[PDB]
């Protein structure tokens, strides 16, 4: 791939996410979904293997149909209210179709299978888009058409994406499904919220955004995709195995590190509206994935792992790769708790 | 299973018991399918006829727990006279547990079922009682 | 028997569909594909949109000639499949005509029918405009206004088939 | 929800105008001035009323207009009409173009015979206003009355109470 | 009706030129005369199997390109728009990127077939 | 609703099902795809044309352009799957298993 | 309440935080912090290299918690002015009890035996 | 819109074809125009809860508009009775119908 065709690709998988966000009209939001399916697609064959080909298909026929649904929805809702103006629908059958065409959008469970295998055929920079730039539109969706959503529906969803990412993960060694794992138990606290409080999901949504960035940042620094590569970083750079663990711990929600933040906002938004069974359920259910964040500590900070000979080459080179904003992302993934109520700018 | 879980808690505790186990073994009956169908969906059973034993071990199992549990919450709430005590569905709920360690020949997933779905059960009858909302609906 | 010929096409509309839906060789489904086309033509043409009903018509026959070029070179076997070959295929095809025949028969019979959600049998027309005299077609000017309202459009639309070719360039250089 | 109002077919009546499509187009723009004002008085009538049945008087005498109008076509220039509309209804499309021989011996009769004068290009497709003795409707949509608006959050900002209150936060 | 009509007599036309084909000559079928043809000798696997396409990048583009007509096809209604600065411009920005894409899949060498 | 529109969602369904229900070739499964954007197309032309929504006209169009970039990159993927390993089954597709 | 504006002209009338603001101190520490990692990552010594870059980081963070945390409190002040107007809109559903003393109202004893 | 970019720059990207009631070419009206603007007049500025309530009648008149199910009903119940009427040799059309 070319430099500038690189950034073209790349520019235009922006323009259709934010086409999704401005548009007012649901034929300009499936555009905006299109323009971004179109664009990724490339990004993830951009190795051209078997495996990024067979990760880059089972993504086109997830995302392809998921589009169908979606347009199905805008067409019913037509129908039933004239009209194409984004906001709630004016009919169940579409908000039913609307909200699990999202939701496969999304990889929720039970359509989370291709999140997995997805994010495991690509490399670490296109599974960094993958699992945080790709949430933006879909989310972006839910947050204009939950007052027409099913509650039983999206509380389901949302449930059994907290228990089947956090069961996922504890089976996985590779860091791209424990990645993906994570992603669709947090996906669930998002949407679990969703019909209390819209502004909790953007907050969870962003402080999610901050951290699997963060962490992606780290595995590229170092080229590790697998548990044993990512437990050398102690003899290569230390200081980078004690950014892993403050992130893992704030991935974890931990007191007092960020990743708290979230999944206490959304405990009390639950707890107004006299959910307690639910909040109290997904609290426990995130456990397992900090069980599956502490190995990862176990394994890269806490204990020194066996090395080779040949990794003394390394300890004569400096770190090449960019790298960007991660001294800026790791202090926002571990020190905001004290700040809060600057929730309120998402208001 | 709106119309199903209704029509369990329209008839009273402790009163027509077999209405109620014909409710409890259609709620159990329509958890075994639904475990059948993802389990041959996902993992493909080698023959149709093997593919129709599986649906049928796990129809069957799955309606025995409902069966027994509301044979069992809904006889002891009778003969205790205790209509509306949580201990009733504790009662039920451990006894399904039995029915599914039995079906399972295995003591220590008997013991553990009984442990968790007797309080799971308990903890339901509390939530009618009290009127804890799962799925809660917005207000606020 | 000609007030019903919104319907009529409909049906065949639906049997292409349960064609190409059974996935016999991909041959035969796309002759599945192209009769739907056809007939899915004539329904657009009878709602007044002659315009919408030949674009289509015209579209898919140039993706089903690609399409069948494709299958020669990359989804064909020694004995491609017809409806008839296989089981799976067969079971498949005679299920849709079952449950499109049963839905026809009892629409036809009660003027209406109840299929999940109510659908009223009177045939097509009676839902139809009864005051036309414009010197226009409609569906002309609302087309023809993408030129004109559909600005944003236009330039989504057009650059989305720019970085299409962009990315199918990149997606097939091994 | 209610009856809807039908006149009679009494009410309906009127002396048709039944020429064919040729005749009208041949005889149009002649009577597109000498029937301007009854025409222009229904067409107001129609938009602003937005209901038939509430223009029906206004529709009778733009009927009897055209048939007046009609009537001294029929006393005066017979002949030379009937040579017009009939080149005017050979053609598939009716197209002027191809009798404006006929078009000029219809237009000077009628011009020495009765001061008609041929509207110009453009003329016809003037918007033109039309004194009115009827009132403008008032409720033309039959609308109900409107939901009142939310009540006006209005005064001075000022700051929030002890902060955000958010738990133990001061600020 | 006369479309339909037309069409009907059309294709009923062709039909019963077939019937009459099939019917009216006297037929001697055999093994031999039936069999695949290959200039006298018996073909070597079937003619079902694979036949790469070396054109198939340009069959592709042709899909997207031939969707680009669907959308200029209007263009001789849209140019009777009161609104003639913007429809011109945009008919003539539609065209150019149509022309650009050309542009790249020619210097990009996606029209040379596979070899 | 109308017959008409029995018959047009009956259509987008049985594809819907014939998309989700794989067999071997992928192209079965694209060509699945493309009806249910021609049963897409269909019903809201219908729709369209039907309410006199003049300027809506426009968008069954806008629809057919982006079918065919769909067509187009599934076609695309189909290349590269049968490069890879010969034939366009999708049971050669099971390398992310593990 | 201007729509997609960041600060709308009425969130002048308040008054901005002050530049000693204790959370715009820990913005800036949040600053200072992730340029020390900065350095760290890069096998620079952390406390003296760069300091050129070490201030940028102090600043970039400083100035723009400084714009969030004025929507921060712009936020707050919004919802209790509607919070108020609200309630003045509808008194009777913000009724002011009648308050009785501890002499009067009946609390229950519960020994501690 | 999640970011009502449209609105601060006061340009107008897609909400021009987002109701059949807005400005048409050549002012060819949609056959429920009426209903519509009905409906969007009677519920503008006080917000979704306050409308699913307070407009109710012009949303119902205008889906019935829409898709004329109270029409068909009615209509499919005279025909039903002609026919009742035919067979049992209790009705004569008029020459007119
Ligand atoms: C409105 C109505 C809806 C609209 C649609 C109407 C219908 C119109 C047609 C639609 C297109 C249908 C496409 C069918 C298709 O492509 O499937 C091919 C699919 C795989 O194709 P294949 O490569 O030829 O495989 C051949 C053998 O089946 C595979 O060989 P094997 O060795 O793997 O055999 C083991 C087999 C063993 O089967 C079992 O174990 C069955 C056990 C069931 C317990 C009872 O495994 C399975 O079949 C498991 C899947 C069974 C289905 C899931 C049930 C749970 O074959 C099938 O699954 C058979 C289904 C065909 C009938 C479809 C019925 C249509 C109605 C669907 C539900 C509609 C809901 C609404
Ligand atoms: C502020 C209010 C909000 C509160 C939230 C909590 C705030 C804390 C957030 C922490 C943010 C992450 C940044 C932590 C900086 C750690 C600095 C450090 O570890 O020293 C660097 C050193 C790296 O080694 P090197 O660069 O090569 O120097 C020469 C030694 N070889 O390191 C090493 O050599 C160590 C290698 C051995 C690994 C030992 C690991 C155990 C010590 C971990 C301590 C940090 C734990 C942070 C987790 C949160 C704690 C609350
Ligand atoms: C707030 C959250 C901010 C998150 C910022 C993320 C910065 C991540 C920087 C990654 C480290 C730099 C790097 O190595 O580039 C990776 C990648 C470019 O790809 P690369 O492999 O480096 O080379 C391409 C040549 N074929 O770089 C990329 O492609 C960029 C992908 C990340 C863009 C999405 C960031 C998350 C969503 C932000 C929305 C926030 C609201
Ligand atoms: C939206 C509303 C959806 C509600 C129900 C959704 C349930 C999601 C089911 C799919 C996700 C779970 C996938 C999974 O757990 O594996 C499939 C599982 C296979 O394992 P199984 O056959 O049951 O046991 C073999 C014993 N050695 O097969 C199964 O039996 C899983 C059954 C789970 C049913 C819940
Ligand atoms: C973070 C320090 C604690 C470390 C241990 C971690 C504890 C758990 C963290 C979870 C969050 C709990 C924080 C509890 C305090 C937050 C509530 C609060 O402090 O009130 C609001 C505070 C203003 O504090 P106030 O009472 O008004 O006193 C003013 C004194 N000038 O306004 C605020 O909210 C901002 C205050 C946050 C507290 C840290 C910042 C204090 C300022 C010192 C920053 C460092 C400046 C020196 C820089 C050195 C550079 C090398
Ligand atoms: C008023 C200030 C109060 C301090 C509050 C501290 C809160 C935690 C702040 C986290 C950010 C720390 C800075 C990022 C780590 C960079 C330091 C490092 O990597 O190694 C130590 C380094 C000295 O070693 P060297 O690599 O050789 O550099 C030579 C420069 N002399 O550089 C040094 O000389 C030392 C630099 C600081 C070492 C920090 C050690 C880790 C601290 C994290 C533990 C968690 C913090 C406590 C939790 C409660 C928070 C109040
Ligand atoms: C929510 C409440 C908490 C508030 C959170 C606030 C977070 C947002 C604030 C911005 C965060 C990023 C700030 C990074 C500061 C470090 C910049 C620096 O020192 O760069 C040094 C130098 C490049 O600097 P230079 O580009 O020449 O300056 C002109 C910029 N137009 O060359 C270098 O060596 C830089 C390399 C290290 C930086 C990482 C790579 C990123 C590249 C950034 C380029 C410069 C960006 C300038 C930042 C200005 C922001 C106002
Ligand atoms: C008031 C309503 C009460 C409703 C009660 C609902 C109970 C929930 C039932 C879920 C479905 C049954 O759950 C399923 O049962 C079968 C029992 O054979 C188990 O099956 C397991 O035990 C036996 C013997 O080993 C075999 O069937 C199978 O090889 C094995 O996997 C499944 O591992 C389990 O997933
Ligand atoms: C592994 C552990 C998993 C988590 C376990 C958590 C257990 C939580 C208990 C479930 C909540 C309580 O359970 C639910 O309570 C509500 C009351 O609001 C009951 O609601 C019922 O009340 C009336 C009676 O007053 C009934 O006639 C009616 O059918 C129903 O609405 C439900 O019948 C019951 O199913
Ligand atoms: C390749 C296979 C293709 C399969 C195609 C399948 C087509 C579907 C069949 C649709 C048949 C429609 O059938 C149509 O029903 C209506 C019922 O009112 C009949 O219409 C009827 O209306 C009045 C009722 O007052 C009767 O007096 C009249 O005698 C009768 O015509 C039509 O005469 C008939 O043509
Ligand atoms: C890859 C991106 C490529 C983008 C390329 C875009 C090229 C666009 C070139 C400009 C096309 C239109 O060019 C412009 O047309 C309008 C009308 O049509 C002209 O306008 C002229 O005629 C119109 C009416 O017809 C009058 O209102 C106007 O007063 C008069 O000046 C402009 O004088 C001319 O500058
Ligand atoms: C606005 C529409 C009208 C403007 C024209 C738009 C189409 C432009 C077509 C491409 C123009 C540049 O791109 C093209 O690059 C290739 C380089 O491989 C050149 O092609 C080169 O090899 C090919 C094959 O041998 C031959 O065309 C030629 O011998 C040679 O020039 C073309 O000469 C050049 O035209
Ligand atoms: C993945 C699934 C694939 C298959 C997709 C099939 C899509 C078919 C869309 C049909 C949409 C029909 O939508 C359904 O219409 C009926 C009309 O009687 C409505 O019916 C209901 O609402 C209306 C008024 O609100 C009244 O009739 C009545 O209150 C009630 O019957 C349903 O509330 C609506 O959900
Ligand atoms: N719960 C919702 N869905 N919305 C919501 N956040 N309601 C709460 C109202 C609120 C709270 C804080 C602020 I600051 C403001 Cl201005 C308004």
Same mark, same amino acid.
């Given at each position: 791939?070319?430099?500038?065709?690189?950034?073209?690709?790349?520019?235009?998988?922006?323009?259709?996410?934010?086409?999704?966000?401005?548009?007012?009209?649901?034929?300009?939001?499936?555009?905006?979904?299109?323009?971004?399916?179109? =664009?990724?697609?490339?990004?993830?064959?951009?190795?051209?293997?078997?495996?990024?080909?067979?990760?880059?298909?089972?993504?086109?026929?997830?995302?392809?149909?998921?589009?169908?649904?979606?347009?199905?929805?805008?067409?019913?809702?037509?129908?039933?209210?004239?009209?194409?103006?984004?906001?709630?629908?004016?009919?169940?059958?579409?908000?039913?179709?609307?909200?699990?065409?999202?939701?496969?959008?999304?990889?929720?469970?039970?359509?989370?299978?291709?999140?997995?295998?997805?994010?495991?055929?690509?490399?670490?920079?296109?599974?960094?888009?993958?699992?945080?730039?790709?949430?933006?539109?879909?989310?972006?969706?839910?947050?204009?058409?939950?007052?027409?959503?099913?509650?039983?529906?999206?509380?389901?969803?949302?449930?059994?994406?907290?228990?089947?990412?956090?069961?996922?993960?504890?089976?996985?060694?590779?860091?791209?499904?424990?990645?993906?794992?994570?992603?669709?138990?947090?996906?669930?606290?998002?949407?679990?919220?969703?019909?209390?409080?819209?502004?909790?999901?953007?907050?969870?949504?962003?402080?999610?955004?901050?951290?699997?960035?963060?962490?992606?940042?780290?595995?590229?620094?170092?080229?590790?995709?697998?548990?044993?590569?990512?437990?050398?970083?102690?003899?290569?750079?230390?200081?980078?195995?004690?950014?892993?663990?403050?992130?893992?711990?704030?991935?974890?929600?931990?007191?007092?590190?960020?990743?708290?933040?979230?999944?206490?906002?959304?405990?009390?938004?639950?707890?107004?509206?006299?959910?307690?069974?639910?909040?109290?359920?997904?609290?426990?259910?995130?456990?397992?994935?900090?069980?599956?964040?502490?190995?990862?500590?176990?394994?890269?900070?806490?204990?020194?792992?066996?090395?080779?000979?040949?990794?003394?080459?390394?300890?004569?080179?400096?770190?090449?790769?960019?790298?960007?904003?991660?001294?800026?992302?790791?202090?926002?993934?571990?020190?905001?708790?004290?700040?809060?109520?600057?929730?309120?700018?998402?208001? | 299973?709106?119309?199903?879980?209704?029509?369990?808690?329209?008839?009273?505790?402790?009163?027509?018991?077999?209405?109620?186990?014909?409710?409890?073994?259609?709620?159990?009956?329509?958890?075994?399918?639904?475990?059948?169908?993802?389990?041959?969906?996902?993992?493909?059973?080698?023959?149709?006829?093997?593919?129709? =034993?599986?649906?049928?071990?796990?129809?069957?199992?799955?309606?025995?727990?409902?069966?027994?549990?509301?044979?069992?919450?809904?006889?002891?709430?009778?003969?205790?006279?205790?209509?509306?005590?949580?201990?009733?569905?504790?009662?039920?709920?451990?006894?399904?547990?039995?029915?599914?360690?039995?079906?399972?020949?295995?003591?220590?997933?008997?013991?553990?079922?009984?442990?968790?779905?007797?309080?799971?059960?308990?903890?339901?009858?509390?939530?009618?009682?009290?009127?804890?909302?799962?799925?809660?609906?917005?207000?606020? | 028997?000609?007030?019903?010929?919104?319907?009529?096409?409909?049906?065949?509309?639906?049997?292409?569909?349960?064609?190409?839906?059974?996935?016999?060789?991909?041959?035969?489904?796309?002759?599945?594909?192209?009769?739907?086309?056809?007939?899915?033509?004539?329904?657009?043409?009878?709602?007044?949109?002659?315009?919408?009903?030949?674009?289509?018509?015209?579209?898919?026959?140039?993706?089903?000639?690609?399409?069948?070029?494709?299958?020669?070179?990359?989804?064909?076997?020694?004995?491609?499949?017809?409806?008839?070959?296989?089981?799976?295929?067969?079971?498949?095809?005679?299920?849709?005509?079952?449950?499109?025949?049963?839905?026809?028969?009892?629409?036809?019979?009660?003027?209406?029918?109840?299929?999940?959600?109510?659908?009223?049998?009177?045939?097509?027309?009676?839902?139809?405009?009864?005051?036309?005299?414009?010197?226009?077609?409609?569906?002309?000017?609302?087309?023809?206004?993408?030129?004109?309202?559909?600005?944003?459009?236009?330039?989504?639309?057009?650059?989305?088939?720019?970085?299409?070719?962009?990315?199918?360039?990149?997606?097939?250089?091994? | 929800?209610?009856?809807?109002?039908?006149?009679?077919?009494?009410?309906?009546?009127?002396?048709?105008?039944?020429?064919?499509?040729?005749?009208?187009?041949?005889?149009?723009?002649?009577?597109?001035?000498?029937?301007?004002?009854?025409?222009?008085?229904?067409?107001?009538?129609?938009?602003?009323?937005?209901?038939?049945?509430?223009?029906?008087?206004?529709?009778?005498?733009?009927?009897?207009?055209?048939?007046?109008?009609?009537?001294?076509?029929?006393?005066?220039?017979?002949?030379?009409?009937?040579?017009?509309?009939?080149?005017?209804?050979?053609?598939?499309?009716?197209?002027?173009?191809?009798?404006?021989?006929?078009? =000029?011996?219809?237009?000077?009769?009628?011009?020495?015979?009765?001061?008609?004068?041929?509207?110009?290009?453009?003329?016809?497709?003037?918007?033109?206003?039309?004194?009115?003795?009827?009132?403008?409707?008032?409720?033309?949509?039959?609308?109900?009355?409107?939901?009142?608006?939310?009540?006006?959050?209005?005064?001075?900002?000022?700051?929030?109470?002890?902060?955000?209150?958010?738990?133990?936060?001061?600020? | 009706?006369?479309?339909?009509?037309?069409?009907?007599?059309?294709?009923?036309?062709?039909?019963?030129?077939?019937?009459?084909?099939?019917?009216?000559?006297?037929?001697?079928?055999?093994?031999?005369?039936?069999?695949?043809?290959?200039?006298?000798?018996?073909?070597?696997?079937?003619?079902?199997?694979?036949?790469?396409?070396?054109?198939?990048?340009?069959?592709?583009?042709?899909?997207?390109?031939?969707?680009?007509?669907?959308?200029?096809?209007?263009?001789?209604?849209?140019?009777?728009?009161?609104?003639?600065?913007?429809?011109?411009?945009?008919?003539?920005?539609?065209?150019?990127?149509?022309?650009?894409?050309?542009?790249?899949?020619?210097?990009?060498?996606?029209?040379?077939?596979?070899? | 609703?109308?017959?008409?529109?029995?018959?047009?969602?009956?259509?987008?369904?049985?594809?819907?099902?014939?998309?989700?229900?794989?067999?071997?070739?992928?192209?079965?499964?694209?060509?699945?795809?493309?009806?249910?954007?021609?049963?897409?197309?269909?019903?809201?032309?219908?729709?369209?044309?039907?309410?006199?929504?003049?300027?809506?006209?426009?968008?069954?169009?806008?629809?057919?352009?982006?079918?065919?970039?769909?067509?187009?990159?599934?076609?695309?993927?189909?290349?590269?799957?049968?490069?890879?390993?010969?034939?366009?089954?999708?049971?050669?597709?099971?390398?992310?298993?593990? | 309440?201007?729509?997609?504006?960041?600060?709308?002209?009425?969130?002048?009338?308040?008054?901005?935080?002050?530049?000693?603001?204790?959370?715009?101190?820990?913005?800036?520490?949040?600053?200072?912090?992730?340029?020390?990692?900065?350095?760290?990552?890069?096998?620079?010594?952390?406390?003296?290299?760069?300091?050129?870059?070490?201030?940028?980081?102090?600043?970039?963070?400083?100035?723009?918690?400084?714009?969030?945390?004025?929507?921060?409190?712009?936020?707050?002040?919004?919802?209790?002015?509607?919070?108020?107007?609200?309630?003045?809109?509808?008194?009777?559903?913000?009724?002011?009890?009648?308050?009785?003393?501890?002499?009067?109202?009946?609390?229950?004893?519960?020994?501690?035996? | 819109?999640?970011?009502?970019?449209?609105?601060?720059?006061?340009?107008?990207?897609?909400?021009?074809?987002?109701?059949?009631?807005?400005?048409?070419?050549?002012?060819?009206?949609?056959?429920?125009?009426?209903?519509?603007?009905?409906?969007?007049?009677?519920?503008?500025?006080?917000?979704?809860?306050?409308?699913?309530?307070?407009?109710?009648?012009?949303?119902?008149?205008?889906?019935?508009?829409?898709?004329?199910?109270?029409?068909?009903?009615?209509?499919?119940?005279?025909?039903?009775?002609?026919?009742?009427?035919?067979?049992?040799?209790?009705?004569?059309?008029?020459?007119?119908?």
């Amino acid at each position: 791939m070319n430099p500038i065709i690189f950034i073209i690709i790349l520019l235009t998988i922006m323009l259709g996410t934010i086409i999704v966000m401005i548009s007012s009209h649901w034929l300009l939001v499936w555009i905006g979904f299109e323009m971004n399916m179109l =664009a990724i697609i490339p990004i993830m064959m951009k190795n051209h293997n078997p495996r990024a080909t067979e990760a880059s298909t089972k993504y086109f026929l997830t995302q392809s149909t998921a589009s169908m649904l979606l347009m199905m929805a805008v067409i019913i809702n037509l129908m039933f209210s004239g009209q194409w103006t984004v906001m709630k629908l004016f009919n169940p059958m579409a908000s039913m179709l609307m909200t699990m065409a999202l939701a496969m959008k999304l990889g929720m469970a039970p359509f989370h299978f291709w999140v997995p295998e997805v994010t495991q055929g690509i490399p670490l920079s296109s599974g960094l888009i993958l699992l945080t730039w790709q949430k933006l539109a879909p989310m972006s969706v839910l947050y204009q058409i939950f007052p027409s959503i099913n509650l039983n529906l999206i509380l389901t969803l949302s449930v059994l994406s907290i228990l089947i990412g956090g069961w996922g993960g504890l089976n996985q060694t590779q860091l791209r499904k424990i990645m993906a794992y994570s992603s669709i138990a947090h996906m669930g606290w998002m949407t679990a919220v969703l019909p209390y409080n819209p502004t909790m999901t953007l907050l969870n949504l962003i402080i999610y955004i901050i951290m699997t960035s963060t962490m992606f940042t780290m595995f590229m620094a170092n080229s590790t995709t697998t548990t044993l590569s990512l437990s050398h970083t102690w003899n290569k750079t230390p200081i980078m195995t004690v950014l892993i663990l403050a992130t893992l711990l704030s991935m974890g929600g931990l007191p007092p590190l960020s990743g708290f933040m979230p999944k206490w906002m959304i405990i009390q938004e639950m707890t107004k509206n006299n959910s307690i069974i639910l909040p109290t359920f997904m609290a426990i259910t995130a456990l397992l994935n900090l069980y599956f964040y502490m190995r990862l500590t176990y394994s890269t900070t806490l204990t020194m792992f066996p090395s080779t000979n040949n990794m003394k080459m390394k300890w004569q080179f400096p770190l090449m790769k960019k790298m960007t904003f991660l001294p800026t992302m790791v202090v926002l993934s571990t020190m905001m708790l004290p700040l809060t109520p600057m929730l309120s700018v998402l208001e | 299973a709106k119309t199903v879980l209704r029509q369990y808690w329209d008839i009273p505790e402790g009163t027509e018991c077999h209405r109620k186990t014909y409710a409890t073994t259609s709620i159990g009956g329509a958890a075994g399918l639904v475990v059948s169908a993802y389990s041959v969906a996902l993992k493909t059973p080698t023959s149709f006829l093997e593919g129709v =034993a599986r649906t049928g071990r796990y129809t069957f199992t799955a309606a025995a727990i409902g069966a027994i549990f509301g044979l069992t919450s809904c006889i002891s709430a009778q003969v205790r006279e205790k209509p509306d005590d949580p201990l009733n569905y504790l009662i039920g709920g451990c006894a399904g547990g039995l029915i599914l360690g039995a079906r399972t020949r295995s003591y220590g997933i008997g013991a553990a079922a009984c442990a968790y779905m007797g309080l799971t059960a308990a903890l339901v009858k509390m939530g009618q009682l009290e009127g804890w909302q799962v799925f809660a609906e917005p207000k606020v | 028997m000609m007030l019903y010929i919104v319907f009529i096409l409909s049906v065949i509309f639906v049997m292409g569909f349960v064609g190409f839906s059974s996935k016999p060789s991909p041959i035969y489904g796309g002759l599945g594909l192209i009769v739907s086309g056809g007939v899915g033509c004539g329904i657009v043409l009878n709602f007044g949109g002659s315009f919408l009903g030949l674009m289509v018509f015209l579209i898919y026959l140039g993706g089903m000639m690609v399409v069948f070029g494709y299958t020669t070179a990359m989804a064909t076997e020694q004995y491609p499949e017809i409806w008839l070959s296989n089981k799976a295929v067969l079971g498949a095809f005679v299920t849709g005509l079952l449950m499109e025949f049963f839905m026809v028969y009892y629409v036809l019979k009660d003027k209406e029918v109840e299929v999940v959600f109510e659908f009223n049998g009177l045939g097509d027309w009676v839902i139809y405009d009864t005051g036309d005299s414009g010197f226009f077609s409609e569906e002309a000017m609302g087309i023809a206004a993408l030129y004109s309202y559909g600005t944003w459009l236009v330039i989504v639309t057009g650059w989305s088939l720019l970085i299409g070719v962009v990315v199918i360039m990149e997606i097939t250089r091994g | 929800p209610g009856i809807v109002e039908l006149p009679s077919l009494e009410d309906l009546k009127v002396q048709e105008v039944k020429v064919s499509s040729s005749v009208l187009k041949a005889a149009a723009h002649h009577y597109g001035a000498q029937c301007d004002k009854p025409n222009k008085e229904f067409m107001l009538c129609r938009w602003e009323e937005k209901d038939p049945r509430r223009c029906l008087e206004e529709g009778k005498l733009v009927n009897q207009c055209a048939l007046e109008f009609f009537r001294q076509i029929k006393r005066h220039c017979a002949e030379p009409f009937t040579e017009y509309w009939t080149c005017i209804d050979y053609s598939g499309l009716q197209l002027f173009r191809r009798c404006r021989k006929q078009q =000029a011996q219809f237009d000077e009769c009628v011009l020495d015979k009765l001061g008609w004068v041929r509207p110009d290009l453009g003329d016809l497709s003037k918007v033109t206003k039309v004194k009115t003795d009827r009132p403008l409707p008032e409720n033309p949509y039959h609308s109900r009355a409107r939901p009142e608006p939310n009540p006006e959050v209005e005064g001075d900002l000022k700051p929030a109470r002890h902060g955000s209150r958010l738990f133990f936060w001061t600020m | 009706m006369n479309l339909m009509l037309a069409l009907l007599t059309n294709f009923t036309l062709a039909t019963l030129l077939v019937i009459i084909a099939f019917w009216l000559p006297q037929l001697n079928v055999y093994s031999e005369k039936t069999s695949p043809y290959e200039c006298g000798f018996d073909p070597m696997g079937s003619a079902r199997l694979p036949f790469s396409m070396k054109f198939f990048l340009v069959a592709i583009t042709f899909l997207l390109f031939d969707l680009e007509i669907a959308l200029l096809l209007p263009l001789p209604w849209a140019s009777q728009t009161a609104n003639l600065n913007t429809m011109l411009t945009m008919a003539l920005f539609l065209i150019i990127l149509l022309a650009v894409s050309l542009a790249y899949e020619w210097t990009q060498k996606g029209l040379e077939w596979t070899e | 609703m109308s017959m008409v529109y029995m018959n047009i969602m009956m259509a987008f369904t049985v594809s819907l099902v014939g998309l989700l229900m794989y067999r071997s070739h992928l192209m079965s499964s694209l060509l699945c795809l493309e009806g249910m954007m021609l049963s897409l197309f269909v019903m809201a032309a219908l729709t369209i044309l039907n309410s006199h929504f003049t300027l809506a006209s426009m968008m069954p169009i806008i629809l057919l352009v982006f079918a065919a970039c769909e067509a187009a990159l599934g076609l695309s993927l189909l290349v590269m799957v049968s490069n890879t390993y010969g034939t366009d089954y999708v049971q050669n597709l099971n390398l992310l298993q593990c | 309440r201007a729509t997609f504006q960041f600060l709308p002209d009425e969130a002048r009338s308040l008054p901005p935080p002050k530049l000693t603001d204790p959370r715009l101190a820990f913005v800036g520490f949040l600053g200072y912090c992730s340029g020390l990692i900065d350095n760290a990552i890069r096998r620079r010594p952390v406390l003296l290299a760069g300091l050129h870059r070490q201030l940028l980081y102090i600043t970039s963070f400083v100035f723009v918690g400084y714009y969030l945390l004025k929507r921060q409190d712009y936020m707050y002040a919004v919802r209790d002015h509607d919070m108020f107007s609200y309630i003045k809109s509808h008194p009777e559903d913000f009724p002011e009890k009648d308050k009785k003393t501890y002499g009067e109202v009946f609390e229950e004893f519960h020994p501690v035996r | 819109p999640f970011f009502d970019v449209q609105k601060r720059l006061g340009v107008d990207l897609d909400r021009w074809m987002t109701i059949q009631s807005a400005e048409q070419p050549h002012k060819i009206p949609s056959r429920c125009h009426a209903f519509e603007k009905e409906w969007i007049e009677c519920a503008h500025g006080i917000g979704s809860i306050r409308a699913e309530k307070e407009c109710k009648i012009e949303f119902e008149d205008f889906r019935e508009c829409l898709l004329r199910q109270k029409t068909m009903k009615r209509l499919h119940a005279i025909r039903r009775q002609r026919e009742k009427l035919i067979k049992e040799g209790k009705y004569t059309p008029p020459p007119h119908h």
